[PDB]
């Protein structure tokens, strides 16, 4: 009924996207104040990442080995340092388009917009969720290494994600902006298959609340008894903090969260019944409770 996924307006991030080249490797960087952030494997050929000692590899690089292009302007690199798996290139020019920003680390199930870029050039914006197995699926990040994910709240940009690599299955892995990987992945040429992906329970309940707000109303009182049922259909556990988050939606629809959980209980058992929920026949799990109140 017109309930749509929203991407954040990407202009504040577009103004920060640059191209970083080191040898034969070119990828996207993020220019904030006088620092450019990018994956540390920018210093590596693919053969370098067979058995990389990144501290030793970085010792062999100088500032002049880093070529930073911001549109038509080359930015001179005047310092470099590793923070976890992110490289920080100090440049001689502070970005005059730097927005208010902060670096945050998010949790599976939380959503964010990704600005896919090709070699510093913005291509498209996608609203994504952090899957429980910490991967992002889709071809839009192919050839978009170093693109970032973000939320915007009152024109403050919370950067939460930087893309590092596509796995042989086609799913993607990355870090936060402090350079710590989401999930058990490594910037090394080695097998590292993603774990089993599960369904984000708290988001499905938010979507059911969105389904009640737009008039779809055909629908385990205790939290613990519901979790006993949810853990059997490959759904994530519902914490007491989750029920707190669903409070706002619960007050608006007047529907108790545990009552909504009771409704989710039997949807997983019976089936589709050939009917639709918000123009969908499957349960949707990529809208957070915040995303729903944001729209409704």
């Amino acid at each position: 009924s017109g309930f749509r996924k929203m991407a954040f307006p990407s202009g504040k991030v577009e103004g920060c996207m640059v191209q970083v080249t080191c040898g034969t490797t070119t990828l996207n960087g993020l220019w904030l104040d006088d620092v450019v952030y990018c994956p540390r494997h920018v210093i590596c050929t693919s053969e370098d990442m067979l058995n990389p000692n990144y501290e030793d590899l970085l010792i062999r690089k100088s500032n002049h080995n880093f070529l930073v292009q911001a549109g038509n302007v080359q930015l001179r690199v005047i310092g470099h340092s590793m923070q976890n798996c992110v490289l920080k290139l100090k440049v001689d020019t502070a970005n005059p388009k730097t927005p208010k920003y902060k670096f945050v680390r998010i949790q599976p199930g939380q959503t964010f917009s990704v600005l896919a870029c090709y070699n510093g050039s913005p291509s498209g914006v996608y609203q994504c969720a952090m899957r429980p197995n910490f991967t992002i699926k889709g071809s839009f990040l192919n050839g978009s290494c170093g693109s970032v994910g973000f939320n915007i709240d009152y024109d403050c940009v919370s950067f939460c994600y930087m893309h590092h690599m596509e796995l042989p299955t086609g799913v993607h892995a990355g870090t936060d902006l402090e350079g710590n990987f989401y999930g058990p992945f490594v910037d090394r040429q080695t097998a590292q298959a993603a774990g089993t992906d599960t369904t984000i329970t708290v988001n499905v309940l938010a979507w059911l609340y969105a389904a009640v707000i737009n008039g779809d109303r055909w629908f385990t009182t205790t939290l613990n008894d519901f979790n006993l049922v949810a853990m059997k259909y490959n759904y994530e556990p519902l914490t007491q903090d989750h029920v707190d988050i669903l409070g706002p939606l619960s007050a608006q629809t007047g529907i108790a969260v545990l009552d909504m959980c009771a409704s989710l209980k039997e949807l997983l058992q019976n089936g589709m019944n050939g009917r639709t929920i918000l123009g969908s026949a499957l349960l949707e799990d990529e809208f957070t409770p915040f995303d729903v109140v944001r729209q409704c």
Binding site: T25, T45, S46, H164, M165, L167, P168, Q192
Partner: peptide, 16 residues
């Protein structure tokens, strides 16, 4: 062959 892609799929730079 490669374990990790960072570039457009058919670029030789992907492959160690």
């Amino acid at each position: 062959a490669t374990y990790l892609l960072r570039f457009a799929s058919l670029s030789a730079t992907n492959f160690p």
